[model samples]
Target: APFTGPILTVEEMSNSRFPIPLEKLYTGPGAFVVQPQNGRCTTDGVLLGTTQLSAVNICTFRGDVTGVAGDYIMNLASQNWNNYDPTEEIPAPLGTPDFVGKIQGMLTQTTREDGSTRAHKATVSTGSVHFTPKLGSVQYTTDTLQTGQNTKFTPVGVIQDNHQNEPGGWVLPNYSGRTGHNVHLAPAVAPTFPGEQLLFFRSTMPGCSGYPNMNLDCLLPQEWVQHFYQEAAPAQSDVALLRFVNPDTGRVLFECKLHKSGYVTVAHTGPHDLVIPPNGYFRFDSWVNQFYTLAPM
Candidate 1:
């Protein structure tokens, strides 16, 4: 049964005792699709509580520079980033993003023999990235495997409870587990509130098909990447809306556009509740990580 209490304003919603079905949350449209190397996404959509990072490799690209832009860019990985796209009929979940202090990878412009830009040189440089280190790089030619081509490092697993299961807590996969890539976290150890138990995420994209530092076998497609390379791609750049939605009705509850960055004496926004409904979810993009969290500070 739905709660019949007063509709929460932003303030009242935070400390309220309302129960939101946390386990039911999932990602929706305009996000990364499911795949083998990238972990998983359900028909039900994005999973929130679990710490599984999927590899879509959006917003960057590598591989044979001479290769077709459409084939190699995004299809090589993902198109992940949380911002606006005018091409989309609706660019909700992300309103105007805060581009004030935004930092993107530097565009690489290498000469190509075939009158085209080098594949590796067409995209941004690694200096632009703080973490998700695989971007703006290429794999060694003789390596047995590459990041995108390599087998899964961590087995596609779920959060597990301890052996006893007496009561319950999240037990992460550990060092010196079994050989081969296999991980499993199976059990219903949480729920009843959305975004309550989690804070470090909202959306995700694979920085690489494999772990960081091994190979540059990963590259993503982006409007930005194409611009330097001179492709006739549509407006795939950022400019998205930031919005929180109710999954059931698929309606925006609370939203705010891009506001300039700086200390202001007064809080400009009003007192309205951005409700997180049962199974509600958020969508946006981040370069540092798909969820946009930076190094611990």
Candidate 2:
């Protein structure tokens, strides 16, 4: 039978066998080639210094940087896609390291010999960071409030294994400078309603070893204490209005109205103290970001 451009017989398809003569095959322009000479790249016998090739089925390039220092593989990808510039280098958060590597070109699609789609895949076999599945739990409770005095309430929670190695630490924003008892009061006159008081506390205990007291353990428990003071008794039918405020800036964050004996639970936000009128009766509780480890199932 006369040949008609790379065709397979029925027997060849069933037996999974196909044969083609080496001399009869026509090698297109050339297979992907990589030649690194004097800080330049040559692909398929073509000089591609700072240039790009697109719409190719397969490509392979190799280069050696022996005895060469401060050399980069250069734009592995083109400018069309979000390309990471070499000069600036991507900035990671405080604890994360910037990504470092080459930016090769991108492949949109690949196909098989029978015109079937072939999914292109990539393997990122780099980095020394290893992550494991972890489980955590949280618990909440309240403490007795004392009259005419500032009390210290330590939140209850569990610290899991490897918690100290995580990034970021707990920090207390409002109570940074002063320690022990601190008194806050509401306005005595009308039109000056009392604002919510927020207490922020963060803890990454033990600090990172050999890191100048850095809190590398991000799993540290964080708590926010909000104190709401009622200016006066509400109307018989009305409820008390509570305004949550930023302790540092005196800015109101949010507001909530509570009825008699009513309460609000702020989760992942922080602890709270609702101080009502008439002898300064108050309810105190905490919203603690806790962590507990669980055995694998």
Candidate 3:
């Protein structure tokens, strides 16, 4: 049979001020090339410094609503999706929960009949869910209300994780940061969302090991902006949540609404492409363990 490459590409908008990186697609700039080798994942490891990674399948959940083939993506699907990071230290809210799970699969390589090549496929299984770290019921005053007046309620969710050290009491460099892009065995502790599961990735976070100390900026990097348009745009709105955090203090600094159209023409300096509502914050969910996806027999 003849061959053709994967079909996916970034979009193009004209005369826009924001100017999202149009040249890149699927992944962002300087991404590694991951190809299929006989139905398994095969990487040349010859990093394509100019290319971006491909989009993987993902599952998103919040309360009773679960979006398999969910509508979101980031530059590194494994590290950032829905523009949220789960590596943060703060917990999400009590109810109205929101998190994402990426499918983890096995990969193997095989040589082709022709001496020149091989192919790969990622054999995925249902994976773990990533809950956002957040805070709930922050009192806010609207035009009709004052600080003491207390008007409407604001809901928020932050990311939290157990940054455990292996064996001895030694801190691992690079690994010490929030967990992103790590693999988990499947038929996950939780079941897979219904239907044919595909390879996917996700993230959500708020504060760091220490809360309210670090002066960090967690915005959607250029790589993720591209992925949003190529891999996620078709599924729903050309938008994704951009959750920013202070890694040092483990606190969510900003959670902005990102739209494909607005991102293109937003200002370059200051908080243009992103927005943090006066009432935006993440809350924790205490009953997360009780939630699970039913497995298929």
Candidate 4:
């Protein structure tokens, strides 16, 4: 179906801005290329860089975004994808001295790969992305993400094992800050939106959208999705949701529930509109759990 909502004009998509201060596409002046955590999770969920060491998948949950593919070499898709300039060195979101300003989220195949209910892997491996410094502008050593040693130019990861022994927001270093994301695994858990489910978090990778293949997690877009996790795909009834509310007046624009393997045409431009809305965000639902809770705000 067509994206029946207001999308980012060509210029908006190309411009640099991300819901997270980290910047769109994660191609900021700096970043962290983290090693994949314990390789646990079966789907995308939230991360809480806490004092404890844990593992989770950066799934299509509140993440997994994709930009509409473009036809030409010079176009908006090019802007949507930016390289992980690890050399710039992000001064660790906070603490965890071992993090030497070189990391990209601990993106390992943390999900069920050949190791799960089905022989499938999570699609958008690169959890978050940043924009700016258009594609092809500089020579990025490796555009794709790898669980192995090919990664470079990243920042401190969350609960990543071995690397730093902590997440970015850990208090061990006496720091306070976190990636821009809300919704839940639960109340005593990470911030979560009421009524949000685990399935709704499925999102596409913008880097998987076009050129510069910045976030290797989703290098090939949707079809690549089939190759990555065909057996593990959710049922048609199980879908994810993304809400966009106008921040100024605290008004919301109705949204649609998307499939875990489906494309989010509405967010094709970027997720700023989705998460940028006042109390707006992305979430999921499964066959057993479903609803588009319009808060009546």
What's each prediction's clash count?
30, 12, 51, 43
Runs in model 2 deviating more than 4 A are 1-81, 86-165, 170-297
Candidate 4 has a TM-score of: 0.21
Score each candidate by Cα lDDT: 0.21, 0.18, 0.21, 0.23
TM-score of each: 0.19, 0.15, 0.17, 0.21
Worst 10 residues of 4 by lDDT: 71-80
> Model 4 segments beyond 4 Å from truth?
1-241, 246-250, 254-257, 262-275, 283-297
* Order by lDDT, highest first: 4, 3, 1, 2
Report the lDDT tens digits of candidate 4 across residue range 2-119.
Answer: 1122232211221111111111221111122322211112222221121111111111011112222430011111111333232322222101221111123221222224442211
Model 2 agreement with the true structure over 117-170: per-residue lDDT tens digits = 211112110021211000000111111011212111111111221333222122
lDDT of 1 by residue, 54-172 (tens): 22222223322222322122111222323222223211111111011111222233343434331121222112222121221221111111122211111111111123221011112
Question: Model 3, 1-297: lDDT tens per residue?
Answer: 111112222122110101122222111111212211101111111111111233221111111111124012111112221333433332221111111211112221122343332212221111222222221111111111111111111121122223321111011111111444322111111112233121111122222222221111112232343333343423133332333344456566533223322221111222222233323322211111212221221
Best by lDDT: 4
TM-score of 2: 0.15
Ordered from best to worst TM-score, the candidate numbers read 4, 1, 3, 2
lDDT of 3: 0.21
Candidate closest to the true structure, highest TM-score? 4
